[PDB]
Design a protein around this ligand. Structure first.
Ligand SMILES: CC(=O)Nc1cc2c(-c3ccc(C(=O)NC4CC4)s3)cccc2s1
Lengths: 7, 268
């Protein structure tokens, strides 16, 4: 599943 | 007081929508918590500010490829940044999510624009460190891409870096297993992740083992030329990765569309 990642 | 704040806008990021009341200009208002600032910079004036303000100042020479800092303020416990806001805009992350894998032509235009933007950063002595689809805005009208969020950035240096607070899944193998990297080679790696992402519809690696692995599997039909360039950028040995010149001279990079043409063919 495609998702945002944190910095 | 010069600007009217609006609604929040991107998780864990404190950025609001705004309008400059003077010329009714769309802006973005980023707040940074002083107690969260890890890397501190110094202005020519000797004013201690977050690295981000220094980097934005250096790159804001009117090259439309990077979001320009229009102003900043100091507050007791925070800093406030005013950045230009294109309208209408969608970030590349949301864009890929909604559209899936991009046609090579569009990917080419986008990628080229990103390279130009990154080169300009480097020419200005700034290293982004957090190149990713989330950090790229698309001007849907102009077909221009703009690089954002320098909160993980640093001053460009030709020596080794031993700190990193960017996005891990975009970070290179050398970081993962040695805690050290060189700016330009790290950037190229992340650009390889980015290009995969455009053409495949998502990033290739999720786990450190995959990163370190350097096994690039294609889920989607991608041309040989593009696969070659991606594999090249994602070479395990930093020294094996192409320079920006090499990237831009690659066969896959020939015949880029102008941002205008891109808008007409792909965004209208
Ligand atoms: C963390 C961080 O620095 N985030 C940043 C976001 C931005 C932005 C924007 C992000 C999304 C925008 C938007 O209007 N999205 C609506 C859907 C239309 S503008 C613009 C300029 C500088 C920054 S810095």
């Amino acid at each position: 599943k495609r998702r945002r990642h944190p910095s | 007081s010069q600007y009217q704040v609006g609604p929040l806008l991107g998780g864990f990021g404190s950025v609001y929508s705004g309008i400059r009341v003077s010329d009714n200009l769309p802006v973005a208002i980023k707040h940074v918590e002083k107690d969260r600032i890890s890397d501190w910079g110094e202005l020519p004036n000797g004013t201690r500010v977050p690295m981000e303000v220094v980097l934005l100042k250096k790159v804001s020479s009117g090259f439309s490829g990077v979001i320009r800092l229009l102003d900043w303020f100091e507050r007791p416990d925070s800093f406030v940044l005013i950045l230009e806001r294109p309208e209408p805009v969608q970030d590349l992350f949301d864009f890929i999510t909604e559209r899936g894998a991009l046609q090579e032509e569009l990917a080419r235009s986008f990628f080229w624009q990103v390279l130009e933007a990154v080169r300009h950063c480097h020419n200005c002595g700034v290293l982004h460190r957090d190149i990713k689809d989330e950090n790229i805005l698309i001007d849907l009208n102009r077909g221009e891409l703009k690089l954002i969020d320098f909160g993980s950035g640093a001053l460009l240096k030709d020596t080794v870096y031993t700190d990193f607070d960017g996005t891990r899944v975009y970070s290179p193998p050398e970081w993962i297993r040695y805690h050290r990297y060189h700016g330009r080679s790290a950037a190229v790696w992340s650009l390889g992740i980015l290009l995969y992402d455009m053409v495949c519809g998502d990033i290739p690696f999720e786990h450190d083992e995959e990163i370190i692995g350097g096994q690039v599997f294609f889920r989607q039909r991608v041309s040989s030329e593009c696969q070659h360039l991606i594999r090249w950028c994602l070479a395990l040995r930093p020294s094996d990765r192409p320079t920006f010149e090499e990237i831009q001279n690659h066969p896959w990079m020939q015949d880029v569309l102008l941002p205008q043409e891109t808008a007409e063919i792909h965004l209208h």
